[PDB]
RNA sequence: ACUGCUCUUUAACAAUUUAUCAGAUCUGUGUGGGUGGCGUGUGGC
């Protein structure tokens, strides 16, 4: 509940920067000093903000075609949760396929449009050939 | 050291009972506008 609830708090900073176009350092400083968030472990916050590496844009380019909803109309909350759900095993692979998938779908279940997690899980079929440690 | 192991492919609708044949006017800035109340005292006649 310390590394688990970590991601459901850094998705906030991710979306925040995405709307603000600031630096990730700015948004992380403001998020931490904004509310004392202990559901995230500080180092896992550091890892999730390192989850703004260029490869993240890359995991947007791979799963681009087989998206049941187009890129230039997807919700920013969906953009962030998608980046995280694909990055869970881009390099980190802290937990295997099912664990990280369920993590992304549930700990971000309370942010979508009542159905978004369905289609993000459905696009996760295109996530298979890059999430190899099944 | 010893919770976590895919939930399966982005919204799921309101308007609704006679009656219809759709069926004259865009003027101002002519003109003025832009000491006193009371008390008391003093005198006078």
Q: Greatest CA separation found in chain A?
A: 39
Task: Give which of A62, A34, A113 is closest to A85, Cα–Cα.
Answer: A62
Q: List the resolution, Å.
A: 3.8
Distance between CA atoms of residues A27 and A36, nearest Å: 14
Distance between CA atoms of residues A3 and A76, nearest Å: 24
**Considering just the CA atoms, what is the radius of gyration of chain A in Å?**
14
- Give the contacts of A125 (CB within 8 A, at least 6 positions apart): A66
| Strand nucleotide closest to residue A104 (CA to C1') | B6
Q: How many angstroms is C1' of B42 away from CA of A102?
A: 111
Give residue A57's region: left, alpha or beta (phi > 0; psi -120 to 50): alpha
**Is the Cβ–Cβ distance between A44 and A75 less than 8 Å?**
no
Experimental method: cryo-EM
Asked whether residue A34's C-beta has any atom of DNA/RNA strand B within 7 A, the reply is: no
Domains identified in chain A, total number: 1
Residue range(s) defining the domain that contains residue A80: 1-134
């Amino acid at each position: 509940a310390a590394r688990r609830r970590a991601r459901e708090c850094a998705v906030q900073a991710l979306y925040s920067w995405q709307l603000s176009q600031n630096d990730i350092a700015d948004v992380e400083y403001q998020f931490l000093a904004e509310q004392d968030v202990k559901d995230v472990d500080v180092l896992y916050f550091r890892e999730l903000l390192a989850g703004v590496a260029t490869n993240t844009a890359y995991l947007d380019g791979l799963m681009k075609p087989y998206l049941s909803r187009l890129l230039e109309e997807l919700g920013q909350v969906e953009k962030a949760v998608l980046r995280i759900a694909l990055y869970e095993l881009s390099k980190r692979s802290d937990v295997p396929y099912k664990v990280a998938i369920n993590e992304a779908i549930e700990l971000a279940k309370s942010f979508g449009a009542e159905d978004s997690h369905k289609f993000v899980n459905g696009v996760l079929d295109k996530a298979a050939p890059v999430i190899r440690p099944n």
